[model samples]
Structures are given as C-alpha cells and as structure tokens.
Target chain A: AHMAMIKMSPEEIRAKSQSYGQGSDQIRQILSDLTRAQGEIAANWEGQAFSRFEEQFQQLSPKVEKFAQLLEEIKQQLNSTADAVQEQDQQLSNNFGL
Target chain B: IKMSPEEIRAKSQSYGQGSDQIRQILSDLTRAQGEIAANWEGQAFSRFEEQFQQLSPKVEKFAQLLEEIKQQLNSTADAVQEQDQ
Candidate 1:
C-alpha cells in the first residue's frame, strides 16, 4: 500500500526503470523509421491507396509515440516511487538508531 | 499496385521488429514486477502490485497495435511484390 513496510532495495526498481527506458527508446526508433518510410513512399507514390496509408500512418505514429511516452512516464514513476521507498526506509531506520 | 515495394517491405520489417521488441519488453516488465513483489518481503506492497496490474491494458495495446501495423504493411508489400511492384 505504502512504502513503510518495504524491505527490498529500491535500486532494483531503478534498474527496471532503466530497462523500461530502453524499451521506450526502441519504440521511438521504430516511430522514426516509420516516419522516414512514410516520406519515402509519399515522394514517389500517391493516390487513394497511398492516401489511405498516409491517413492510417498518421494516426498510428502518434499512438506509437504515445506508447513510448507512457513508458517514459512510467519510468519517472518508478524512479520516484523507488526514491520514496528508499527515503521511507532511511527514515524508519533512523527511528531505530540503525 | 506498387509504390516502392522495397520501402514497404523494409517498413514492414521495421514494424515486425518493433513488435517483437515491445512484446519482450512487456514480458520483462511483467516479470520484474512479479519478482519485486515476491522478494520485497513486505506486507503492504500488495498495493503497488495492484496499481501495476491496472496498467495492463494500456501497455498491452501498444504491442498489439505494432503487430497490427506490421501485418498491414506486410500485406501491402506482398500484394505489390506478387504481380506488381
């Protein structure tokens, strides 16, 4: 529920956060590649078919980016939560003079 | 029916690769969450686990969407490659 009863190292959570960031980076790379491909195709291709692709691509790219952004936001949350738990441990330990 | 089938194929591959990466990431994240829950040696951390479970759909849909895009691109590329590009 809260951080007061936790016993594991918050560092583990921090580590997970770092991994999440890596995933987000990979997602961003995919989005970047998609953006480039969209332009490449657009340059030499057009018509209702291409227009459909463009419309779908435009919608999907943001969603892909949103996924990355969510990971980033979650990373921040993990880091912050880890910090909070660590602080609580420190505070609680201080109470016992440990 | 062919607009740079090569680019389409390449992007399809990109989407497929991204989908795999995301699925693995999600798997790792889920496993990590469980490991943390089991090893934390605590009582109230159940709350943390519950909160994480809440994100299940939002996180899963991203991977699914990537797969969808991959399939769409692959279908387009295949169509172009067969008789057209």
Candidate 2:
C-alpha cells in the first residue's frame, strides 16, 4: 500500500498533457485570429493613432507559441516523473509485503 | 464599445499585467516541477504539500488570463474608437 498521494500519476498526467496541448492550440489559434483582426482594423484606419497600438499588439504574435512550448516541457517533465514514481513504487512492492 | 481614453489606458495596463502574471505563473510552475523531480527520490512526501500550495496560484492565473483577454478585446475596441475619432 502506497501511503503518499500523487497529484497526477503517469497515465493521468498523459491525459492532462493531451488536454493542455489542446488548450495551447486553442489559445494560439485565437491569438492568430486576433492578429488578423488587428491587421484589418489597422488597414482600415491608416495614418491614425491606432497604428502604434497595433505595433505593440504585434509583439504578442511571437509570444503566442510560448504557452505551447511551456506545456510541452511540462509534459516531458511529468512523463519522466511518472516513470520515476512507477519505478520506485515497483521497487517498494518487490521489497515489502504491500 | 466606445471607452474613454482613461478606460482604454486602464484596460491596456491590466492586460499587460495579466500577460506578465501568466508568464510568471508558467515560470514558477516549471521551476517547482524541476524541484519536485530533484527531491522526489530523496524526500518522497515531505515537501509535496508545499508544492501543492505553491501551485494554487496557477489555478487563479488561468481565470485571470481569461479576464484579461476579455479586457484586451475591450481595449482593442477602444483603440478603434480612437482611430475613428
């Protein structure tokens, strides 16, 4: 019997990783649409004050993938942690009665 | 929606802060995950409670990010208004 509580085990974490991956994609798509919308708005109002804000908004374009990258790294780390936990749990079971 | 310049500025700043908070939450979570892995073998259950507590803000951060995204859209609307004016 394992006494410790794990927030997410191997399979559970893999499931979450899948969900988070979807979330990342959704966010990226929304931001991409927002960028496109901003472009249309910018083109409509040329030689206007909003151009500067659009420039600032453009900076977020590169950052759209930032969450995706982070989630990928998190998934990898969680995968390894799950593997480690399973190995240790197996070792404990082999040695102990429970 | 037509917002006053002050309103636009406020929302812009709020969105900026929200973006910063999102980045910080990710950074903090990644660091804690690394720490958990480093310590898992040596201290199985001693510090996990602390890690759980530390991750509490991550839940809040998502809500906060969504709110900021809404505000960002509002701010964009205000930008359009300013351009039209």
Candidate 3:
C-alpha cells in the first residue's frame, strides 16, 4: 500500500524537504524572542511576588530547547531521507542504462 | 519593584502572544511531517516515520505546557489588576 501511493519523485521529495528546511530561521527567531522575554521577565520581577513565575520561566527554557532540538533533528532526517531516495533513483537509472 | 503594574501586564501580554505563535508554528510543523511520512517510502522514510511518532507526543506535551503557561500569565494579569484596586 505504501509503494502504491508513492507518486512523488525523489527530486520532488527533496524539494519538499528543502522547503521544510527554510523554516529553520523562523523557528530559531521564535525561540530567540521567547528566550529574550524569559530573561526580561526574570530581570523585571523581584522578591516573593514573582518567585513562582520565575520558576515557571526557568522551566520554560528546556521546553523551548526541546522544540528547537527536535526541529533540527527532523531537518537532518529529512535531508538524509532525500539523499537515500536520490541514491535509489540513481541505482534504478544505472540498471536501466546497462 | 523595577516595573510598574502596567509594564508587568504588557510583558505578560507579549508572552501570551508569543506562546500563541509558537503553538501555531508547531502545529504546522507536525502537519507537514505527517504529509512527508505519507508521501515517502522505503526504510529511509520509515526512520522518519518513527521520529514523527515520537515527536507527535512531544509536541502535544509542549502544547499542553504552553496552555498552562498562558493560564498562569492570565492569572498574573488578574493579580496585577487586583493590586491596582
């Protein structure tokens, strides 16, 4: 069933992966802004009034990092997948030519 | 305090907006990943499928966490309002 629906050429898939890769900068920017806000909050608040909020800010960094790290991992996986598919295409072409 | 109540409210509002943006972007990323999985084949793609399955739950967890943070920020805004009373 999987192969039956595989209509995209390796080139097309690579293009899609590249499209996804383009979002890297946007994701990084979002995380940067979020981190800056976290620091701003930490600096802007003080004393017992914001201890809980400060703790929340501390907890937030890892969540944000997890997101960034996952996106990077997925981008790498996409690149690898594209390369593998392209290799398969080349092999098929060579066999036909021979 | 270094910041006025108005400043605190403004900061919380910025965070609320940013959280919304992050949630939307992540949802889009998840959808794109699902589409990639659907179109791709072979062992290479299967690896991505496994990652997608793993990442999907993590995204949901992140969404839930953001929701909690948004609520907390809202509460902060309310507390600020009360302090002004």
Candidate 4:
C-alpha cells in the first residue's frame, strides 16, 4: 500500500482495497493511510499478542490454545500469500515487463 | 483437561481459511500493485521490500516467521500429547 497510484493498474488498485467497493484513487488513498495505521497496530499488537499467548499458552489453555490455533491458521494463509508474492517477485526480478 | 492434537489441529484448520483469504487477497493486490515502477519493461516488484533494506531477508523472515509459529504450536500440541497419556 504505497502512496503512488500513477504506477498502478485499475485491476491492481481494486485488489488492494479492503474491498473492491473501495476502488478509487481518492478512496484508496484514504484506505492506504488507514492500512498504514493497521501496520502500526500490527507492529504494536502482533508481538505482544504472540508473546502473551506463547507465555501463557500452557496455563491459559482453551483460550491461548484457541489463539494459537487461529494463529497457525493465519500463518498458513500468510504462507500461501507469501507464495504468490514470491512468484510475483520472481516475475518482477526477471522482467521489468509487466 | 485433556485434548487430542488432532482435535486441536482440526480446530485450527477450520479457522485457517480466514487468514488464508486475507493473505490471498493481499497477494493479489501486491502482485497487481508491483513494487517497482512498470516501464516499457513494465515491472513492479513488492514495495514491502523498501522498508527493510535487505529485501530478500524480509521475505525470508516472513516465511520463517510463519514456519516458526506453526512449529511452536505443533510443538505445544506434542508436549501436551506427551502428558495427555
């Protein structure tokens, strides 16, 4: 989610939004900013969240267990997503021809 | 309170799709966005790399983090299984 829109395709811009409904440069600008905020949130929360669960996971079973389970699931999704990113990276690395 | 690792894994599998969906969409968008400016040799690589100077390391980190977390969870399940019996 970068500030520049001139470089993007309509299809790409659409995919980036929280929803396809938020598909406009102006709107995406806002969404992109909001997403930036979320990065902060992720930075702030993800470690604490993961750490808290990891620390208390054994004692906080059922609850931490649930989080762990969800986290693992999330990781799986992230891994797949990473696959796409990697594939794209390969393409980009090879050819500047998009 | 005893639980089976399969049971725990099964539960995780159910919720796994939600995160996967987000990642997939994000991937679609990032791929669409292109990190580099597309030129006649149109190319947009991941801008996510810009934040960290070592782009390859960051990518590796992401993959590593996911694997580590999953391993931790599975290890926990294994530990629990040891005591469960």
Candidate 5:
C-alpha cells in the first residue's frame, strides 16, 4: 500500500516556482530597506568602534542575498525542467498525431 | 573597579566571536547547498530546499541580535571605564 503524501503536478510546480521567486524579490526589498537604515544610522557615528558593527550589520545581507539568489535559481530551474519535460510529452503526442 | 572594564571588554570580544562563528556556519551551509544543487533536484531536492526557507531568515535575525548584544557590551565597557575615571 502506498501511503498518502504531498505531491506536485507540472501546473502546481509552475505555480510554486513563481511563489518562491516572489519570495526572493521580497527578501531583496527587505535587504534594500536594511541598507538604507544602516546608511542613515552611520551618519551619526564616526568612531572606529562603529566600524566593528558596520561589518556586522552587513553580514546578514550576503547570507540573505545568497539565499535570495538561490530562490530565483530554483525557480528558473524548476520552470525549465518542467518545460523540458512537457515539451517532450507534447512531441510524443504530435508524433502520433494526437 | 580595576577588573570591571577588562571583564566587559572580554565579554564584548566574546560576543563578537559568537557572531563570527555564526557567519562561518552560514558560509559553510550555503556552500553545501550549492553542492546539493549541483548534484540533485526534482521532488527530493525541491522539498529539501523548502525546509531551509526559515533557516536564512532565522539566522539573519540571530546574527543581528548577537551583534546588537555585542554592541551593547562594548558600550557597557565604555560606560564602565568612564565611571572609573
């Protein structure tokens, strides 16, 4: 007996691809906002002590950026793979004049 | 008074180190994710990546909080020294 589990169809996969792509875009916007906040905060502080936190503030950006970029990558990869699979599926249909 | 600033300064440095460690872990994790991406995909990898949706954000906040605590510790050390002088 096959136990029930979550599954995805090509249509659902395509739908989810964009959902994560949007998720990535949102994170980038959040990062942009974070940058603006950092710039504004830096205006009042000039000591070497501030430098320590300066880099610290930025540390999250790369992690989030990398993660964001990856989300987009996954989206593109998913759509391409799905498209390729369906393309072949269609070719088989046309070959037999279906 | 003699030991006060020194102790706090140590604490701040430790806090800074904690952030460094997290940063390093993030680096390692991302690198491994890339490796996974290279070698795999489809349902398994797709579902796998979903699990990490929370990870990056969580760690982002975590590192931010640790950095805040570190800055506070540094400020505390400065204030402590100011009092002694």
Candidate 6:
C-alpha cells in the first residue's frame, strides 16, 4: 500500500496502477512511458514551442502518474484505517451494549 | 480539422486551468484517503466521518475535473502535434 507515489494520490494512482486490471505490470510500464513522454516534451518543447507557458505542460504530464499514485495510496490507507476503527467500535459496542 | 486561430487560443487558455484542476481534485481525494487510513482502526463511526468526510466532494470534483480536461484535450486535438498523424 505504500507503493511510492501511491501514497501521494491514491484515487488517480489507482487508475494508473490498474491499467492492466488488479496487479498488472502494465501500470509500471505506463509510468515509464509517462516519464519518457514528459522528458521528451520538456526537452523538445523549448526548442520548438518558444514560450515557457506553451512548453510547461511537458513538465507536467509525467508527474501526472505520480500524482495519481499518491492519491491511490491515500485512499487505501484511509479505507483500511477506517475499517479497523469501525471494527473496534463494533467490538466495544457489543461488549458494552453502547 | 483546422481550428480557427481564435478557437485554438480559447482552448489553450482553458486547457491549462482544466488540467490543474484535475490534478488538484486528485490531490484532495488522495489526501483524504491518507487521513482515513491513518486513523481508521481507532475512529468511531461518527469520529471517522469527522476525519475524512471531505473525500466525497473531492470525488465529485475529480469527475468533473477529468471531464473538463478531456474535453479540452479533444478540442485541442487538431492543434496538438500528434506524431502518428
């Protein structure tokens, strides 16, 4: 669950990590592709795009996956922790009649 | 599929903000998720809600955010330098 960027953005990261459904290597490859795409976009855009504003997106897309991953981790952690607490509460309620 | 210069300008302007908003929504959702996971084991139902209820609006925000960005991308498709084309 602490899969690097997964902790940063779990919601978006979930989609990236599940590109091939469940636990597929496709997500890793996607991240690699994204890294390459962003690198190329950043390096080449300045030569062709002329303006920082136009070329800035090249820097942004690659980070998209990281952001996604971050969200996914966050979500997973949240659910697990909440479930644990809920279970504990249920136990106490049953024991104490509360 | 040649966009008039005006259309290109309009789209480019919106796409930037749209993309950032999508990122922001994702970030918010993720943050809430983290908070929930951290204390889930300890939270009572009401306390749990208090800890991470912010995620709902963020989920909604992400939906809208992605939609708008996709639209922006589609609108600018002709302008983008798609190597395959």
Output the number of the lDDT-best candidate.
1
Badly placed stretches (over 4 Å) of model 6 are A1-55, B1-3, B19-85
| Candidate 4 lDDT (Cα, 0 to 1) | 0.38
TM-score, structure 2 vs. true: 0.47
Can you write out model 1's per-residue Cα lDDT over A35-89, one digit (the tens) per residue? 7866766775677865765776676566557667767766776788788887777
Which candidate leads the pack in TM-score?
Answer: 3
| Model 5 ranges with Cα > 4 A deviation | A1-7, A46-53, A95-98, B1-85
- What are the lDDT figures for the candidates, one per model? 0.69, 0.54, 0.62, 0.38, 0.61, 0.42
> TM-score of predicted model 5?
0.50
What value does the lDDT take at residue A27 in candidate 1?
A: 71
Cα lDDT tens digits for candidate 6, B29-69? 44644553453333333432433254434434433443444
- Model 2, B1-85: lDDT tens digits are 3345555555445545545545554555556555545444445534543443454454345435535554655766677677879
Where does candidate 4 stray beyond 4 Å? A1-98, B2-7, B11-23, B35-64
Model 5, residue A68: what's the lDDT?
Answer: 65
Please tell me which model should have the higher lDDT, number 2 or number 5: 5
Task: Give model 1's TM-score versus the native structure.
Answer: 0.65
Per-candidate iRMSD = 4.3, 8.5, 3.7, 12.5, 10.1, 10.8
Query: Weakest 10 consecutive residues, lDDT, candidate 6 chain B?
Result: B43-52
| B1-85: candidate 4 lDDT, tens digit per residue | 3346765454333223323433343344344334322411222223332322332233233323333444554665677688878
The superposed Cα distance between candidate 4 and the true structure at residue B17, in angstroms, equals: 4.6
**For model 3, what is the error of residue A21's alpha carbon versus the real structure, in angstroms, after optimal superposition?**
2.8
Off by over 4 Å in 2: A1-8, A11-19, A95-98, B1-85
Model 2 chain A lDDT-worst window of ten: A59-68
**Candidate 6, DockQ score (0 to 1):** 0.07
lDDT tens digits by residue: candidate 1, B1-85: 4466677777777767766876787688788778766766655456556655755555566556656766776777787778762
lDDT of 6: 0.42
lDDT of 3 by residue, A10-90 (tens): 666666666456555555676577567667666855667557655755665565666566666767766765566567767
